[PDB]
Amino acid sequence: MPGTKQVNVGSLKVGQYVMIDGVPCEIVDISVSKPGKGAKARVVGIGIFEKVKKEFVAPTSSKVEVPIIDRRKGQVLAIMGDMVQIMDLQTYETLELPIPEGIEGLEPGGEVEYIEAVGQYKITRVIG
Known part of the structure; x- marks a missing residue:
């Protein structure tokens, strides 16, 4: 909105x-x-x-x-090469996001923090 x-x-x-x-x-x-x-x-x-x-x-x-800025958390469900499917931990909705050019060890079941701002999304940190 x-x-x-x-x-x-x-x-x-x-x-x-x-x-x-x-x-x-x-x-x-x-x-x-x-x-x-x-x-x-x-x-x-x-x-x-x-x-x-x-x-x-x-x-x-x-x-x-x-x-x-909308700061959120999701769970990694699948890693298809470059993009990752995560499940938002509040809506339980799924979305596919690019894998941060310089991100640590990412793997299924793991949790991340991502942000939304003016219709754009980006993974910022690994919360675990």
């Missing part, structure tokens, strides 16, 4: 997530400057779901969108 919430540029911190040109990114750099005696920020983010580098400049008082 809800995709993103509005927040002031000025409240953003490195390591947080923000929407830039429609892409949810993790902030890796923030430069804030005050001209004379309104502040302005330059934000550099890298995609959470895709390999992309985005950036924007905006007054610190402006509003920007931040994706609302």
Whole structure:
């Protein structure tokens, strides 16, 4: 239902997530400057779901969108080569997800943590 919430540029911190040109990114750099005696920020983010580098400049008082992140847990049911079928531990619904490019030891019966944000999903950690 809800995709993103509005927040002031000025409240953003490195390591947080923000929407830039429609892409949810993790902030890796923030430069804030005050001209004379309104502040302005330059934000550099890298995609959470895709390999992309985005950036924007905006007054610190402006509003920007931040994706609302759904943190979930599921159980690995099957590993078909590259993609893994997991069962969400709350809905008992099944979904197929790509196997994280650099993930630890994944195997059936095991539990994972995955996230959904603005219609996209990604496996983040192995909960076991």
